[PDB]
């Protein structure tokens, strides 16, 4: 019976003296006792099923957060917290929802419900500042106990939620990675007990994974929309944070005056003289530029901007590469936003795009992801298949697009487009993209021709024009 | 007697005597009657704490004012809304005569306030029996203690 | 069946409440569609007869078909009405006055009848409706009401006082049963 049972720490492992012989592990591996990774503590179901239990004799009895107030979440989010009360730590650990519908609120509520000494992990200071703005109803004495805790200073019991910090490892002041042995954990190194991760996909990377791996970490919750990069690490995240409690939030459940119905499309474009000579012959990182700048595909992108500007729709055009961004945008004479565009000029372009009926198309680089209050529109065109994550295409779509007036309860009232050059490595991404969007509940189709592109003025009207671009791209 | 009294105990409690008991009518099936309760329908429906129901504006505005309007507009029949006091009744229905500009029901109902008059009471019951939602016993507000309890 | 001749004024509720989806597609669509089925069955049972069609909508009365003995006008009018739908609130007093004016003209041995399909709760008319009900019973104009989920007392008295036919309809099957009862002739 476990009334005497010791349990202790060595470098990244838990060893269990004079044992109760617990299920699901090897025995006398190198001594009479059981020995697991720290990170295996998460498997509380394997003892719970057996009817086994354990005690935290290493406890520290100091004080904790109360945060008694409540707020109102979206109908699935409320169902998702209600499930978490239901399931408990044996059968909980991540939630997936867009970066534009209430993820900050799920984190402050997840900490106010769970109610333990908490450390909040985030990607960015702006997101700490959005959390703070969310959290003001549960903030103790409004503004006299909230503080930041990162590379310049630390103070107070709370802040953006409870104490927030960043994932970073540049040196001894880049907080969570550097501090990962001092505080956290109620069961050993026992100052705190609860972990809330915003942007949770960020942690299972090869160096970062160690922050999570080198503890027992009692309660853990993660929140994300991108969930994984193109190589799919996600089997690891079940171990590292916990299993996935939720994924859906389909626009099928929020149509009539609520968000958008999006017609999704992929566009297959043919390939014009000289560009495949050179695509086929070049194996280097330049070849990405011949399939993105393919003038038949540029003419589809131009024709599509013209159709939706003729109807006065608002359009964001995404370009994965600053070269591509500027070659498309300067030719189409639409503003662009990227890293080196300043805050003053970005806020002028974005205010113009949202409120000026003359400024209806803009071009944007990778800087929108991971926190660029991207503006509202009704049309999204991606010039390329990229290598950022099929799941980030759906986060980006979801956070940017809304219903056009009048038509707020129809089958579709917003539009997404991804442009693909036929007979290239750009095509490989489609059978995955298509399967992921339809599994996310989206109506998605393939457009393979445009015989009305043969009825109007567009660029690259000759071989000589196309040759002028081909020489510039090759250089 | 009092019509119903089946749990029996309160009368012997009040008397400090133990009468002979008897149930002395044949009753009809439960299905002709329906006795609902209302409190909310999603997990975000938190405005009904009623720690100070006489002061909780958000609670009066939310399902107390809003559920009444949903139920009355959907179920279009002659329906009387009973209240615990005049002050609640006045706050819940903005009416033609509002206690504030900030009150949360907009729909044709009739009032039943103090200085009721025996002749004036009948006018409101003539209106409710004749037609429309509104009248006395119809889409009208009355405090439960008040005269409407005599009925017609 | 032959023995006498009937005059019947079909009156339909074209108020905003008739748009509702409670009775197939919506009440307006289900009622006009079954009412077309009734006209052909009533005229087949009653070869020497007449009908006229009135609606109450947007707080007025409008004549969809004039009083006549050819069924074709009435099914063509029920077809033409569905497109223009329903909005607003009844005008029952003005509809019983135009119907009265046509019915008063008719001779001694023919019936006087008004058939009303009712999905409202009152009517917008200022005029005293009780004076007009007294006048219907003197004139021998009989008024029947088929109501949707509704028992509002002035309509029910009005159908009882004029002859005894206030009926409630809760399905498309029940409405076809009610119209088919009205297809049935009077004694002679």
From Swiss-Prot, chain A:
Domain of life, per lineage: Eukaryota
EC number: 5.6.2.4
Activity: how regulated: ATPase activity is stimulated by TFIIH subunit p52 (GTF2H4). DNA translocase activity by this subunit in TFIIH is stimulated by XPA, ERCC5/XPG and XFP plus ERCC1; translocase activity is sensitive to triptolide which targets this enzyme.
Keyword Ribonucleoprotein: no
Predominant place of localization: nucleus
Residues with Phosphoserine modification: 443
Keywords annotated in UniProt: ATP-binding, Cockayne syndrome, Deafness, Disease variant, DNA damage, DNA repair, DNA-binding, Dwarfism, Helicase, Host-virus interaction, Hydrolase, Ichthyosis, Isomerase, Nucleotide-binding, Nucleus, Phosphoprotein, Transcription, Transcription regulation, Xeroderma pigmentosum
Helicase C-terminal domain sequence ranges: 299-459
Motif (DEVH box): 198-201
Covalent S-S links between cysteines: none
The protein's enzyme class: isomerase
Post-translational modification: Dephosphorylation reactivates the 5'-excision step. Phosphorylation has no effect on transcription or the 3'-5' helicase activity.
Entry similarity comment: Belongs to the helicase family. RAD25/XPB subfamily.
Function (record text): ATP-dependent 3'-5' DNA helicase/translocase. Binds dsDNA rather than ssDNA, unzipping it in a translocase rather than classical helicase activity. Component of the general transcription and DNA repair factor IIH (TFIIH) core complex. When complexed to CDK-activating kinase (CAK), involved in RNA transcription by RNA polymerase II. The ATPase activity of XPB/ERCC3, but not its helicase activity, is required for DNA opening; it may wrap around the damaged DNA wedging it open, causing localized melting that allows XPD/ERCC2 helicase to anchor.
Protein name: General transcription and DNA repair factor IIH helicase/translocase subunit XPB
Region of the whole protein represented: 244 to 718 of 782
From Swiss-Prot, chain B:
Subcellular location: Nucleus; Cytoplasm, Cytoskeleton, Spindle
Domain of life: Eukaryota
Region (Mediates interaction with MMS19): 1-152
Post-translational changes noted in the entry: ISGylated.
Function of the protein: ATP-dependent 5'-3' DNA helicase. Component of the general transcription and DNA repair factor IIH (TFIIH) core complex, not absolutely essential for minimal transcription in vitro. Required for transcription-coupled nucleotide excision repair (NER) of damaged DNA; recognizes damaged bases. Sequestered in chromatin on UV-damaged DNA. When complexed to CDK-activating kinase (CAK), involved in transcription by RNA polymerase II. In NER, TFIIH acts by opening DNA around the lesion to allow the excision of the damaged oligonucleotide and its replacement by a new DNA fragment.
Quaternary structure, from the entry: Component of the 7-subunit TFIIH core complex composed of XPB/ERCC3, XPD/ERCC2, GTF2H1, GTF2H2, GTF2H3, GTF2H4 and GTF2H5, which is active in NER. The core complex associates with the 3-subunit CDK-activating kinase (CAK) module composed of CCNH/cyclin H, CDK7 and MNAT1 to form the 10-subunit holoenzyme (holo-TFIIH) active in transcription. Interacts with GTF2H2 (p44) which stimulates the 5'-3' helicase activity of this subunit. Component of the MMXD complex, which includes CIAO1, ERCC2, CIAO2B, MMS19 and SLC25A5. Interacts with CIAO1 and CIAO2B; the interaction WITH CIAO2B is direct. (Microbial infection) Interacts with Epstein-Barr virus EBNA2.
Domain notes: Interacts with GTF2H2/p44 via the C-terminus of this protein; mutations in the C-terminal region of XPD do not alter its helicase activity, but prevent its interaction with and helicase stimulation by GTF2H2/p44.
Family: Belongs to the helicase family. RAD3/XPD subfamily.
Protein known as: General transcription and DNA repair factor IIH helicase subunit XPD
Protein's organism: Homo sapiens (Human)
Residues of the full protein shown: 457 to 608 of 760
Curated annotation (Swiss-Prot), chain C:
Localization per Swiss-Prot or TrEMBL: Nucleus
Domain of life assignment: Eukaryota
Coiled-coil portions: none
CC annotations in GO: core TFIIH complex portion of holo TFIIH complex; nuclear speck; nucleoplasm; nucleus; transcription factor TFIID complex; transcription factor TFIIH core complex; transcription factor TFIIH holo complex
Phosphotyrosine PTM positions: 42
Tissues expressed in: Widely expressed, with higher expression in skeletal muscle.
Alphabetical keyword list: DNA damage, DNA repair, Host-virus interaction, Metal-binding, Nucleus, Phosphoprotein, Transcription, Transcription regulation, Zinc, Zinc-finger
Family that this chain belongs to: Belongs to the GTF2H2 family.
Subunit structure: Component of the TFIID-containing RNA polymerase II pre-initiation complex that is composed of TBP and at least GTF2A1, GTF2A2, GTF2E1, GTF2E2, GTF2F1, GTF2H2, GTF2H3, GTF2H4, GTF2H5, GTF2B, TCEA1, ERCC2 and ERCC3. Component of the 7-subunit TFIIH core complex composed of XPB/ERCC3, XPD/ERCC2, GTF2H1, GTF2H2, GTF2H3, GTF2H4 and GTF2H5, which is active in NER. The core complex associates with the 3-subunit CDK-activating kinase (CAK) module composed of CCNH/cyclin H, CDK7 and MNAT1 to form the 10-subunit holoenzyme (holo-TFIIH) active in transcription.
Protein purpose: Component of the general transcription and DNA repair factor IIH (TFIIH) core complex, which is involved in general and transcription-coupled nucleotide excision repair (NER) of damaged DNA and, when complexed to CAK, in RNA transcription by RNA polymerase II. In NER, TFIIH acts by opening DNA around the lesion to allow the excision of the damaged oligonucleotide and its replacement by a new DNA fragment. In transcription, TFIIH has an essential role in transcription initiation.
Name of the featured protein: General transcription factor IIH subunit 2
């Amino acid at each position: 019976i476990p009334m005497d049972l010791f349990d202790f720490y060595e470098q990244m492992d838990k060893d269990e003296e004079e044992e109760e012989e617990t299920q699901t592990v090897s025995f006398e591996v190198k001594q009479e006792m059981i020995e697991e990774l720290q990170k295996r503590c998460i498997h509380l179901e394997y003892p719970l099923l057996a009817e086994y239990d354990f005690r935290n004799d290493s406890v520290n009895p100091d004080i904790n957060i109360d945060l008694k107030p409540t707020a109102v979440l979206r109908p699935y989010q409320e169902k998702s917290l209600r499930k978490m009360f239901g399931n408990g730590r044996a059968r909980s650990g991540v939630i997936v929802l867009p970066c534009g519908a209430g993820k900050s609120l799920v984190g402050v509520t997840a900490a106010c419900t769970v109610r333990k000494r908490c450390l909040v992990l985030g990607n960015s200071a702006v997101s700490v500042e959005q959390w703070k703005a969310q959290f003001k109803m549960w903030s103790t004495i409004d503004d006299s106990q909230i503080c930041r805790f990162t590379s310049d200073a630390k103070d107070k019991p709370i802040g953006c939620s409870v104490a927030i910090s960043t994932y970073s490892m540049l040196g001894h002041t880049t907080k969570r990675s550097w501090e990962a042995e001092r505080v956290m954990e109620w069961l050993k190194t026992q100052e705190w007990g609860l972990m809330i991760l915003d942007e949770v996909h960020t942690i299972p990377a090869k160096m970062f994974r160690r922050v999570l791996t080198i503890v027992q970490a009692h309660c853990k919750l993660g929140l994300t929309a991108t969930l994984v990069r193109e190589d799919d690490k996600i089997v690891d995240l079940n171990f590292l944070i916990g299993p996935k409690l939720y994924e859906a939030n389909w626009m099928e459940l929020q149509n009539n005056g609520y968000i958008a119905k999006v017609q999704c499309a992929e566009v297959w474009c043919p390939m014009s003289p000289e560009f495949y000579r050179e695509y086929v012959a070049i194996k280097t990182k330049k070849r990405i530029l011949l399939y993105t700048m393919n003038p038949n595909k540029f003419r589809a992108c131009q024709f599509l901007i013209k159709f939706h500007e003729r109807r006065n729709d608002k359009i964001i055009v995404f370009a994965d590469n600053v070269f591509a961004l500027k070659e498309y945008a300067i030719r189409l004479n639409k503003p662009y936003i990227y890293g080196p565009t300043s805050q003053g000029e970005r806020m002028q372009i974005l205010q113009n795009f949202k409120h000026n009926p003359k400024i209806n198309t803009i071009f944007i680089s990778k800087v929108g992801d991971t926190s660029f209050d991207l503006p509202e529109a009704n049309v999204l065109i991606q010039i390329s298949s990229h290598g950022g994550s099929r799941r980030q295409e759906a986060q980006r779509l979801g956070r940017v697009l809304r219903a056009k007036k009048g038509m707020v309860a129809e089958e579709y009232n917003a539009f997404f487009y991804s442009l693909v050059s036929q007979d290239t490595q750009e095509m490989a991404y489609s059978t995955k993209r298509q399967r992921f969007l339809v599994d996310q509940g989206y109506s998605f189709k393939v457009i393979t021709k445009l015989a009305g592109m043969e009825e109007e003025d567009l660029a690259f009207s000759t071989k000589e024009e196309q040759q002028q671009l081909l020489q510039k791209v090759l250089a | 007697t009092s019509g119903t009294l089946s749990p029996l105990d309160i009368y012997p409690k009040i008397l400090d005597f133990h009468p002979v008991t008897m149930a002395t009518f044949t009753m009809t099936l439960a299905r002709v009657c329906l006795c609902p309760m209302i409190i909310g329908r999603g997990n975000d429906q938190v405005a009904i704490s009623s720690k100070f129901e006489t002061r909780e504006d958000i609670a009066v505005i939310r399902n107390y004012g809003n559920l009444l309007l949903e139920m009355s507009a959907v179920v279009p029949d002659g329906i009387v809304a009973f209240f615990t006091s005049y002050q609640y009744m006045e706050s819940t229905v903005a009416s033609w005569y509002e206690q504030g500009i900030l009150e949360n029901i907009q729909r044709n109902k009739l009032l039943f306030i103090e200085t009721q008059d025996g002749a004036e009471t009948s006018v409101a019951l003539e209106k409710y029996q004749e037609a429309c939602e509104n009248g006395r016993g119809a889409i009208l507000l009355s405090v439960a203690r008040g005269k409407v309890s005599e009925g017609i | 069946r032959l023995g006498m001749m009937r005059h019947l004024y079909v009156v339909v509720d074209g108020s905003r409440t008739m748009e509702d989806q409670d009775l197939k597609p919506n009440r307006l669509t289900c009622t006009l569609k079954l009412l077309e089925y009734f006209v052909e069955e009533y005229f087949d049972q009653n070869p020497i007869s007449q009908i006229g069609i009135i609606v109450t909508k947007s707080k007025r009365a409008e004549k969809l078909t004039e009083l006549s003995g050819n069924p074709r006008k009435h099914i063509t009018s029920l077809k033409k009405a569905v497109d223009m739908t329903c909005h607003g609130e009844p005008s029952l007093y003005n509809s019983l006055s135009i119907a009265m004016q046509t019915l008063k003209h008719m001779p001694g041995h023919t019936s006087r009848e008004v058939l009303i399909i009712f999905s409202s709760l009152t009517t917008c008319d200022p005029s005293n409706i009780y004076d007009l009900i007294k006048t219907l019973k003197a004139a021998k104009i009989r008024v029947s009401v088929i109501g949707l989920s509704a028992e509002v007392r002035v309509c029910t008295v009005l159908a009882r006082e004029t002859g005894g036919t206030y009926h409630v309809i809760l399905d498309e099957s029940h409405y076809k049963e009610l119209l088919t009862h009205h297809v049935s002739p009077p004694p002679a």
